[PDB]
């Protein structure tokens, strides 16, 4: 499927940016699960904003407002 499209060395690059020196082999499937949960939450709120605006095009600012209400504020796309 596409969650495997989050590739194994991309998760390894994310961990190397995070400062992880050594990664177990089960980190990858769990990181795909966590990423899927996080995008389910952000896209749930973003699609809710977009359904509210009577639109079928999720803008950047809708994702910014979803991230604003969850508490992970994102700068640099509108506000």
């Amino acid at each position: 499927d596409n969650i495997q499209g989050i590739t194994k060395p991309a998760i390894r690059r994310l961990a190397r940016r995070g400062g992880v020196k050594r990664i177990s082999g089960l980190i990858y499937e769990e990181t795909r699960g966590v990423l899927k949960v996080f995008l389910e939450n952000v896209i749930r709120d973003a699609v809710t904003y977009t359904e509210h605006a009577k639109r079928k095009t999720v803008t950047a600012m809708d994702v910014v407002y979803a991230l604003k209400r969850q508490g992970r504020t994102l700068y640099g796309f509108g506000g």
């Binding site: 709120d45 809710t48 904003y49 359904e51 509210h52 605006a53 407002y65 209400r69």
Partner: protein
Amino acid sequence: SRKESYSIYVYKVLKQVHPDTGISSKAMGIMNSFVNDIFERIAGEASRLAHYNKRSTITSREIQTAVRLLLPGELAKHAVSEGTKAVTKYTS
């Protein structure tokens, strides 16, 4: 003066649900602060939502989407259904 609390409304809903059950004064303080908090969250996100679309009118649609943003999944679905039932009964 007088304070404006939801105490008798909590008590009416309690006798509607558990008809012979008591509720303490501290639990009434809990529910007053709770209904003020949930009203504050839903009215605030309806305000932010109507302001984001440059609409100057909070509608029932605004409140519905504020519930869908705020309240988690199946409880949000039941609450949207309850509000829709009440608005449709209000229109007739």
